[PDB]
Amino acid sequence: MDGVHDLAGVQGFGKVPHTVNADIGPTFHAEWEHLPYSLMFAGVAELGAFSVDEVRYVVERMEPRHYMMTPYYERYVIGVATLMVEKGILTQDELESLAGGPFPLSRPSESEGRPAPVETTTFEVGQRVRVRDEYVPGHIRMPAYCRGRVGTISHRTTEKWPFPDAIGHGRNDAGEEPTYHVKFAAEELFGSDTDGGSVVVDLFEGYLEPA
Amino acid sequence: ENAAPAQAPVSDRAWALFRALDGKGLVPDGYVEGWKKTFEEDFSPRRGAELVARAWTDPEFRQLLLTDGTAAVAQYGYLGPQGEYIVAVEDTPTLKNVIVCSLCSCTAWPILGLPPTWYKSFEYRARVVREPRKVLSEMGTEIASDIEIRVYDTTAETRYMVLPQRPAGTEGWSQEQLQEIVTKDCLIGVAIPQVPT
Ligand SMILES: [Fe+3]
């Protein structure tokens, strides 16, 4: 999904609000901030109502201006609440009645997702690969800066996981595939407009093809 | 327009979500309280510091950590949510590694702790992939141009920790003493461990 959450490479932001080893305060800076992760865990592992990938996608689905003005932990309060309504567990009426006011949610999904690709290749360390030049409107774990770009495999995972473009929509056909650490030169991703050296992206097999 | 939607206070919304689920019996007794304590107390960068100090002083452990991080971390019992498949990436005199999750906030929770607000900021997520030398400089860490910066974007299930270089001035220090200088920011990769001056 080419949403505003795909921030890598965007220009115009100011300083990172930190200097190294500064005091960052307590883990939680308000008494409610442990609730989105804990209730997410409840939803995934106790209720089996959704996957972690569905939580990433429902936050991606926040209306773009709403995403941009909402603090991190609050995005996940909104996301988990949205999934609980979509999955028929909660209603928006009871959330708003208990909250005593408006509780707008993420926007509905405009894509049914896609299955794990049937044709993929098993790459080896050192091979050159290109990120498939594909556009996916639903969830995908490919940041656009690497779409269509070429890099080199530095690692193939020894474990395998469901394809996010499927499981992030609750689909039954996510299969399992390994992922690959793909090393890109900075200039391959940003031309002359970068000060870095290399970037490594951890890409599912189904996002890649031989170069 | 382009104004924010009207919304009840976020505390009211978060507890409303809790009460709506809890009152349907969908949240086990002590469940969020238990994870809050785990998040606050057990998931900690003091763990990744322990791992770095061990790697620094034990070549065999260093080798395991760099070839099978998962197995190395599991020897300590520190695998967990957001930290089930671990890769440790090694700094060298010509390579500085830095970690980000440009798409959200993915972090090796059990050994780095939950990510800090700044790592989840749109500033860090947008900028460190493209201009990490400037970002680190602004943050207080100068990386000489004779050193490649490599940014790892945490886009799938691998969860990373940086193994920073051991600074001079620490020869013969104990595990304990070494651990003290490996901070959360060193494990993320935006800081270099410092020896008192
Ligand atoms: Fe993330």
Swiss-Prot record, chain A:
InterPro entries: CN_hydtase_beta-like_N, CN_hydtase_beta_C, CN_hydtase_beta_dom_C, Elect_transpt_acc-like_dom_sf, Nitrile_hydratase_bsu. Keywords: Lyase. The keyword Nuclease does not apply. The keyword Cell membrane does not apply. It comes from the Bacteria. Gene3D superfamilies: 2.30.30.50, Nitrile hydratase, beta subunit. It is an enzyme of class 4 (lyase). It catalyses: an aliphatic primary amide = an aliphatic nitrile + H2O. GO terms for molecular function: nitrile hydratase activity; transition metal ion binding. Industrial production of acrylamide is now being developed using some of these enzymes. Its EC number is 4.2.1.84. NHase catalyzes the hydration of various nitrile compounds to the corresponding amides. Belongs to the nitrile hydratase subunit beta family. Heterodimer of an alpha and a beta chain. This is Nitrile hydratase subunit beta. It comes from Rhodococcus erythropolis (Arthrobacter picolinophilus).
From Swiss-Prot, chain B:
Keywords: Iron, Lyase, Metal-binding, Oxidation. Heterodimer of an alpha and a beta chain. Binds 1 Fe(3+) ion per subunit. GO terms for molecular function: nitrile hydratase activity; transition metal ion binding. Gene3D superfamilies: Nitrile hydratase alpha /Thiocyanate hydrolase gamma. The gene is nthA. Inactivated by nitrosylation of the iron center in the dark and activated by photo-induced nitric oxide (NO) release. Inactivated by oxidation of Cys-106 to a sulfenic acid. Pfam families: NHase_alpha (PF02979). This is Nitrile hydratase subunit alpha. Its cofactor is Fe(3+). Belongs to the nitrile hydratase subunit alpha family. Its EC number is 4.2.1.84. It catalyses: an aliphatic primary amide = an aliphatic nitrile + H2O. Fe(3+) binds at residues 101, 104-106. Disulfide bonds: none annotated. The modification Cysteine sulfinic acid (-SO2H) is found at residue 104. InterPro entries: CN_Hdrase_a/SCN_Hdrase_g_sf (IPR036648), CN_Hdrtase_a/SCN_Hdrlase_g (IPR004232), CN_Hdrtase_asu/SCN_Hdrlase_gsu (IPR023900), Nitrile_hydratase_asu (IPR018141). The modification Cysteine sulfenic acid (-SOH) is found at residue 106. Oxidation on Cys-104 is essential for the activity. Oxidation on Cys-106 stabilizes the Fe-NO ligand coordinated in the inactive form. NHase catalyzes the hydration of various nitrile compounds to the corresponding amides. Industrial production of acrylamide is now being developed using some of the enzymes of this class.
